[PDB]
Every structure is written in structure tokens, then in C-alpha cells.
């Protein structure tokens, strides 16, 4: 792996996560190895493969995403300041997630894998894409733990130790989690 000459054939991602139940890849930047793809600069392509009876933990992305299910089927649930929407996607269905919206994913009761292409469109950091996770795992932890004790102890009106143990996870199975049942 080094830089290049004039191309539009792009076959290699980077793994951001890989466990028991699935993968998280992200195609490299388009203008990265060429000034030829300058126009594709503000967008990123990720790949999402999950297994039967699995959940992607609740999170949000800094960018709007355009999710296309290329294989299988899933349960999409979007959270709102006052609510939730659930969507069933079977193969070939597509749907845009406004950025900032937190959502989780799930491949149903199955025998097959869900295969998802997420088209990310970037606005704050050009060509850059960030996912914020509510949970802690071994990789990165919960974004809520960045807060100082008092802050959290005040916003919540409970004592530190009681936040902690409803803060700080031991999510063995990091990002992807076989729905026990």
C-alpha cells in the first residue's frame, strides 16, 4: 500500500471493526490517490455485513447516510427526541438517514446475512465520517464518559457510582451483538 497513477478502480477498504457477528469497512477516500476524483471528495462508502440474530448498537453519524440493502433483510429503528420509527428492509430497499439521527440495526430471526452499503455524504469535515456510540466496548468506549463527574452527576441527579454502572460497559461483543434471542 502506497499512492498512484490515473484510476477509478477501487477494491480495498479499511476495517473499522470485525468480530463474531460482522464487519465494518470503509472504502478509502476517492481523491486520496488522485486529483482525478476531486468531485467525489465529500462522500464516503462503507460496507456492512452482519449475521443472523445480531444488533448494531445504538449510535449516530455526523453525516447523512444513504443505506442500500444488497443482501438479506433487516429491522431499522430511528430514535427521535420524542419517539421511534421502525422500518423493515428487505433486499433492494433504500432509505436515507438524516445525520444526527441515532439508530440501530438488526438482521432477523434468520439463517442468512444482511449485507448493507452505506452511502455517506459529508458536511462538517469534508470527506470525513464519524459514528458516535452510546456504549463502551474495547476499541473506544461511551461518549458519555468524556464528561467530568459533576457534569454527569448534575444532568442526571444520581450519584457518580450509579451512573458508572449504567454508563460503563463490558460489551464483550463490541459493536455487534447476537440478539440472545
Amino acid at each position: 500500500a502506497q499512492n498512484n497513477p490515473y484510476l477509478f478502480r477501487s477494491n480495498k477498504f479499511l476495517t473499522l471493526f470485525k468480530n463474531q457477528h460482522g464487519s465494518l469497512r470503509l472504502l478509502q477516500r476517492f481523491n486520496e490517490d488522485t486529483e482525478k476524483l476531486e468531485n467525489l471528495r465529500d462522500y464516503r462508502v462503507l460496507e456492512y455485513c452482519s449475521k443472523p440474530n445480531t444488533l448494531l448498537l445504538p449510535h449516530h453519524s455526523d453525516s447523512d447516510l444513504l443505506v442500500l440493502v444488497l443482501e438479506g433483510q433487516a429491522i431499522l429503528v430511528l430514535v427521535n427526541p420524542d419517539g421511534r420509527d421502525t422500518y423493515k428492509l428487505d433486499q433492494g430497499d433504500a432509505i436515507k438517514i438524516q445525520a444526527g439521527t441515532p439508530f440501530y440495526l438488526i438482521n432477523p430471526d434468520n439463517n442468512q446475512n444482511l449485507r448493507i452499503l452505506k452511502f455517506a455524504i459529508t458536511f462538517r469535515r469534508p470527506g470525513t465520517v464519524e459514528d458516535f456510540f452510546l456504549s463502551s466496548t474495547k476499541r473506544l468506549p461511551s461518549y458519555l464518559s468524556a464528561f467530568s463527574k459533576n457534569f454527569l452527576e448534575a444532568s442526571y441527579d444520581s450519584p457518580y457510582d450509579e451512573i458508572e454502572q449504567t454508563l460503563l460497559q463490558e460489551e464483550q461483543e463490541g459493536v455487534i451483538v447476537k440478539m440472545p434471542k
Binding site: 427526541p81 458536511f123 458516535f132 468524556a146 444532568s155 457518580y160 449504567t166
Partner: protein
Amino acid sequence: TLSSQDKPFNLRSRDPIYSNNYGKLYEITPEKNSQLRDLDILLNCLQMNEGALFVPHYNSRATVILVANEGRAEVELVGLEQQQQQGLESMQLRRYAATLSEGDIIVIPSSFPVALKAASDLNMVGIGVNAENNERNFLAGHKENVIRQIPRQVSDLTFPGSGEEVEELLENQKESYFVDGQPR
């Protein structure tokens, strides 16, 4: 005032959108107004009482430029920013913490949680770029709190802890946007 009109006449600020015993938050958007609409910029006014905490939240898409017009502000800004740490852990996350004196500026980028405490009576001017359809998502308190919107067996797997336990803990916050400060 001026019995002649229509143009970009001045504008100032009408009904706060959040307000209580610890603070108010005034906000005009490209939606609700003519001159911003083209700018696609929004604006807001922050008025909090000494020791009051504006619980963590984030703005879906606008980047908010925060000018401290008066008082002292304690600020907690988190995020990851650089995927140039392309293999997960690499771009571990950050806590940018600082107290802003009058005159100071701090930028708040779209998806970053942020919280602030008025270390003294506080008046902040806020200018948010990319302001169309921006929603504020609160992570604590009783209103607009997004966590609390997570289904019981969802929480169950998201957190160390139990569903009963998580409704529990979140219902423990009575206030809504602004909140009494006091530590330990």
C-alpha cells in the same frame, strides 16, 4: 418605529424555546425568518443563572459559533474528528475542556456532545452555520431526551445495566434543558 418598510428591517428575538428557573434559550432559524434563510445561518441567545447546567446535547447539523457576551462559562466538548485514524480505536475520542471568559469563542461542530455550566450569571451569542433543519438532541434531563426513547431490551444490550434500571436512572432527572449545578 419606522412607518416605512419591507426589506431587511431589523429583528431581535421573541418567545424563548426553552426556559425555566435556570435559563432560557432563544432561537431564530432560516426557516422562521427572511434574512437568515439566505444565509442559512441561525442565531440564538443563552441566558443561564450562576451554577446552572445546560445538560449534554448535540445539534444534528449546524455548526454553532458561541460568543461569550458576559459571565464565565465552563465547557465540555467531546468528539472524535479525524478518521485519519482509519482503523477504529486510532481515533479515540476527546474531551476539550475549558472555561470561557468574556470575549472568548468556542466552536461547536454538528455531532459533538457539549454541556456548559454558568460559573457566573451568563449571556451567550450563538451563530450557527448550516442551520437548516437542525434538531438538538438532549442526552439527559426529562425533555427532548433521545436515550429515554430507547426500547427496554435495547438499553439492556446497549448498557452495562438493565432496562428497569435505565428507565430508572433517566426518570431521575426532573428538569429539562437547564439544571441545578452542585457536585461531589
